[PDB]
Short mmCIF file of C-alpha atoms and ligand atoms in Angstrom, two decimals:
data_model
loop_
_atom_site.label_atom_id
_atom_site.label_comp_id
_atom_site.label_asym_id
_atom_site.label_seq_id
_atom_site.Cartn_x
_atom_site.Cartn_y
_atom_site.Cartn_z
CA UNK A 1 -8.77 -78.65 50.09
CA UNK A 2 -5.82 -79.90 52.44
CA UNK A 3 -6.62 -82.23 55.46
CA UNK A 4 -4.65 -81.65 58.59
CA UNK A 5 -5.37 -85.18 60.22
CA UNK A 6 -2.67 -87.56 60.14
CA UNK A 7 -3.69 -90.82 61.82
CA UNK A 8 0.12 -92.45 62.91
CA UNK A 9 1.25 -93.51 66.31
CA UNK A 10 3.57 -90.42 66.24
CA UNK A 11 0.43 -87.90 66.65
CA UNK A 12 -1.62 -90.22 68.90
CA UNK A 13 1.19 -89.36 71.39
CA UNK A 14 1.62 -85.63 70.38
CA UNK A 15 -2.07 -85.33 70.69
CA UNK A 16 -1.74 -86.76 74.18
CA UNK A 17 0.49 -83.87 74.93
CA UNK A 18 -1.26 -81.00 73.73
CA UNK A 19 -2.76 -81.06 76.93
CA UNK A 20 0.00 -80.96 79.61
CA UNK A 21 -0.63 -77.98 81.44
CA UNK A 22 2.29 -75.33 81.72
CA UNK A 23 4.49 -75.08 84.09
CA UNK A 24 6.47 -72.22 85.14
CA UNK A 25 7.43 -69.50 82.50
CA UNK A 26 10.54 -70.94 82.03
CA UNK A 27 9.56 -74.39 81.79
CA UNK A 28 7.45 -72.61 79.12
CA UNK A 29 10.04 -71.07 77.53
CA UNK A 30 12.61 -74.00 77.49
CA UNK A 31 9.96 -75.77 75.78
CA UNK A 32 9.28 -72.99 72.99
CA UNK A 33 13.35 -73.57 72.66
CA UNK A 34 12.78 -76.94 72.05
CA UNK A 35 10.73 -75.98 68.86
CA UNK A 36 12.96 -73.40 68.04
CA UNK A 37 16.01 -75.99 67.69
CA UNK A 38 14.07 -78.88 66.09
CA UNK A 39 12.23 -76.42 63.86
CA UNK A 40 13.03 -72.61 64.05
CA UNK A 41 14.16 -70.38 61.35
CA UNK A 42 15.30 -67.00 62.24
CA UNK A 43 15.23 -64.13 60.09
CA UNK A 47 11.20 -60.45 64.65
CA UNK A 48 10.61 -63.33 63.94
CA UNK A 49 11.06 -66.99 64.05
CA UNK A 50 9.34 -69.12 61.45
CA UNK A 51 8.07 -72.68 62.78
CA UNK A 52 7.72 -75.44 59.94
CA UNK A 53 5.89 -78.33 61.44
CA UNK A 54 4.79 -81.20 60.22
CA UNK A 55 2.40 -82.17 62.99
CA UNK A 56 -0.75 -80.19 63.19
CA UNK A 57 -0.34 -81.16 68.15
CA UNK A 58 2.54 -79.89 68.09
CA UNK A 59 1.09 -76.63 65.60
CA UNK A 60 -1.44 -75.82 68.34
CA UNK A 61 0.80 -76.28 71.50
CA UNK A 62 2.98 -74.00 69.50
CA UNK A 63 0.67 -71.45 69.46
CA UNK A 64 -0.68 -72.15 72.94
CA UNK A 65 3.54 -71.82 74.03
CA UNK A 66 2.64 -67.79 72.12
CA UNK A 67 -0.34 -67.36 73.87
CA UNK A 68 0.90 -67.34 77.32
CA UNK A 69 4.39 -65.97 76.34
CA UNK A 70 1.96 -63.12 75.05
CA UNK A 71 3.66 -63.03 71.74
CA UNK A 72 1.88 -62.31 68.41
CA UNK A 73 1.72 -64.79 65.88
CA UNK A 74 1.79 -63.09 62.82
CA UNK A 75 0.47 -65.91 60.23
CA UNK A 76 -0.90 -69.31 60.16
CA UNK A 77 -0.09 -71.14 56.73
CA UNK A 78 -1.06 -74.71 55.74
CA UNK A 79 1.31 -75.65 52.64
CA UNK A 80 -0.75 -78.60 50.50
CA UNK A 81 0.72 -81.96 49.36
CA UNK A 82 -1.93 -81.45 47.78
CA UNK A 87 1.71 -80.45 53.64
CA UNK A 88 3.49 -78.99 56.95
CA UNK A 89 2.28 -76.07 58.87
CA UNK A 90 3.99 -72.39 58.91
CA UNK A 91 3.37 -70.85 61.87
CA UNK A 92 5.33 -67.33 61.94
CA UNK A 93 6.05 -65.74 65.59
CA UNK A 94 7.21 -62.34 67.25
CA UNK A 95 10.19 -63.37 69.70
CA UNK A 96 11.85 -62.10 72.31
CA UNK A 97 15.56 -62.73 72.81
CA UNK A 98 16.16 -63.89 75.82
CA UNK A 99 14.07 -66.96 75.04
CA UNK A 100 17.16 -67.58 72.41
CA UNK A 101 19.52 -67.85 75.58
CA UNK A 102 18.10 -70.09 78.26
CA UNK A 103 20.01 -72.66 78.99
CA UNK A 104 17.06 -75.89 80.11
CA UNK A 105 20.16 -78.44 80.48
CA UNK A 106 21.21 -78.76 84.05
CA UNK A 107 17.60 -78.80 86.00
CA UNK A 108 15.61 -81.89 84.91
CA UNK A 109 12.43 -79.67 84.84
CA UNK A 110 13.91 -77.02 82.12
CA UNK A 111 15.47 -79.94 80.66
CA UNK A 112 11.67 -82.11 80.82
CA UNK A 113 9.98 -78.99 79.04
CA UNK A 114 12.96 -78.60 76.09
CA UNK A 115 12.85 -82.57 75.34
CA UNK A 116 9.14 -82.28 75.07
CA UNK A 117 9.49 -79.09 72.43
CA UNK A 118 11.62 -81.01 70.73
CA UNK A 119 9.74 -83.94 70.49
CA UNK A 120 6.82 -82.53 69.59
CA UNK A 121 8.06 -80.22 66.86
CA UNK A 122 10.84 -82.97 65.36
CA UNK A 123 10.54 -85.80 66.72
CA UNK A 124 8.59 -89.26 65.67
CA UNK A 125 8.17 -93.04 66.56
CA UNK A 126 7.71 -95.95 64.98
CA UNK A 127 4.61 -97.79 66.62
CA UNK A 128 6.78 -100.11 68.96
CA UNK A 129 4.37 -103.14 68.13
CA UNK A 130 6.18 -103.23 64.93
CA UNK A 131 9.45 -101.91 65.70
CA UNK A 132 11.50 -99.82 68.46
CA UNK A 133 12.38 -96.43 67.04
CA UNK A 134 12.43 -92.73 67.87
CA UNK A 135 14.30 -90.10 66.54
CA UNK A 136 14.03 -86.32 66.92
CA UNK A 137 15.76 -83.72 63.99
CA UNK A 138 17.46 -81.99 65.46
CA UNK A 139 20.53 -80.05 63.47
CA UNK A 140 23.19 -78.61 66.05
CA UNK A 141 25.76 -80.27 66.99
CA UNK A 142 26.20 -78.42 70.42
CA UNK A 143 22.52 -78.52 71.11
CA UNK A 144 22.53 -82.39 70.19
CA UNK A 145 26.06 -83.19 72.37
CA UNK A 146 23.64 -81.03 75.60
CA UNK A 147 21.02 -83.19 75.30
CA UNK A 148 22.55 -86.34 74.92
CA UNK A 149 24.26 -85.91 78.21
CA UNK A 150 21.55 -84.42 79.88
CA UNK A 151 19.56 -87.75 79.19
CA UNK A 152 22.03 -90.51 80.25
CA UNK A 153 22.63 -87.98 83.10
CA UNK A 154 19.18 -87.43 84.66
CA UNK A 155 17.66 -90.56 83.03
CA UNK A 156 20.51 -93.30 82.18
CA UNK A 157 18.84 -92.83 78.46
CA UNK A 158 21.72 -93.76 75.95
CA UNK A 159 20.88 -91.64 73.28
CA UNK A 160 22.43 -91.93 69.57
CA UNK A 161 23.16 -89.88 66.59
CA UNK A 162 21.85 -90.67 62.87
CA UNK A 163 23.87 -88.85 60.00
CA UNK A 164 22.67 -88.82 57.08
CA UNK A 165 22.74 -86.30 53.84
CA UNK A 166 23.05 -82.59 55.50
CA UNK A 167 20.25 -83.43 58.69
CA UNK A 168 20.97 -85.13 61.85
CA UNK A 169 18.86 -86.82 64.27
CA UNK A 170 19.40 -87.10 68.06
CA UNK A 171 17.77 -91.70 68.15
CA UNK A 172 16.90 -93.96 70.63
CA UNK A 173 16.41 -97.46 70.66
CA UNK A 174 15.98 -99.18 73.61
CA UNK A 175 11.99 -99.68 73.98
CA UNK A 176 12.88 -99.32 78.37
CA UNK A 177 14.71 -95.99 77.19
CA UNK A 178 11.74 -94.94 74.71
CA UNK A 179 9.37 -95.39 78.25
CA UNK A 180 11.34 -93.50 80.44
CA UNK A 181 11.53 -90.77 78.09
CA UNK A 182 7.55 -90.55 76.74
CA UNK A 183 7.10 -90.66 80.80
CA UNK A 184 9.42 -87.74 81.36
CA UNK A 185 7.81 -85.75 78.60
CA UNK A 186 4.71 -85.91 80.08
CA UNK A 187 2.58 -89.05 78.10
CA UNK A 188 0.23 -90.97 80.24
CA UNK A 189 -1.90 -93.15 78.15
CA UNK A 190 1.25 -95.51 77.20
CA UNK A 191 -0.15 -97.93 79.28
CA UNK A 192 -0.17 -99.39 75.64
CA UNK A 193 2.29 -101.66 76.89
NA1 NA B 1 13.82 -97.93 62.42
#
């Protein structure tokens, strides 16, 4: 049998945000973009490959109220990541979440959840979200120093890319923006 319980710091968080309620259907849908960049593959429909089982179920909460069929839930063992395949309509490919901090606020928390993870800041300040395109990545970069003086950084290495941060005050702002409450773990 596979387990789907991963006890790090990363999913204490994405557990924490599971939870957020919605927003408005475009918050919604900026979010579901979020996942698409960090983890979509198109090919209907768009396949989700996750690797955190919070972010698997706000995935298919995102569906749920989008009204959009999910057409298969696979767990692949170690003996893992999560396949979660999804009906899609296109003008969810085409929003644009980048210049209105509240688009913006649901698309960094889609990405986050779907690619992104932390070190447990205790030990070390680190997080880092894949996320592959380099338009996509340039967006958001800008959009965080410009709504929340974040200084945001890019790791290359072999064929992936990740959007990093490093600054533990820059880490804050953003877990705050995203929605996290219990970091009074401070
Ligand atoms: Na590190």
């Amino acid at each position: 049998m596979v387990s789907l319980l991963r006890r790090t710091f990363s999913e204490e968080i994405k557990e924490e945000l599971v939870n957020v309620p919605f927003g408005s259907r475009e918050e919604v849908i900026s979010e579901l973009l979020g996942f698409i960049k960090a983890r979509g593959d198109l090919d209907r429909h768009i396949v989700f490959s996750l690797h955190s089982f919070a972010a698997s179920r706000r995935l298919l909460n995102l569906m749920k109220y989008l009204s959009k069929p999910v057409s298969e839930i696979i767990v692949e063992k170690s003996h893992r990541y999560i396949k979660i395949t999804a009906e899609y309509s296109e003008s969810f490919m085409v929003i644009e979440p980048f210049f209105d901090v509240a688009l913006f606020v649901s698309f960094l928390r889609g990405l986050f959840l779907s690619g992104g993870s932390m070190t447990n800041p205790r030990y070390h300040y680190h997080l880092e979200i894949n996320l592959f395109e380099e338009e996509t990545l340039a967006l958001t970069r800008k959009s965080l120093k410009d709504f929340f003086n974040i200084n945001a950084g890019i790791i290359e290495l072999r064929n992936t890319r990740k959007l990093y941060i490093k600054s533990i005050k820059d880490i804050l702002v953003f877990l705050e923006a995203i929605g996290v409450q219990r970091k009074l773990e401070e």
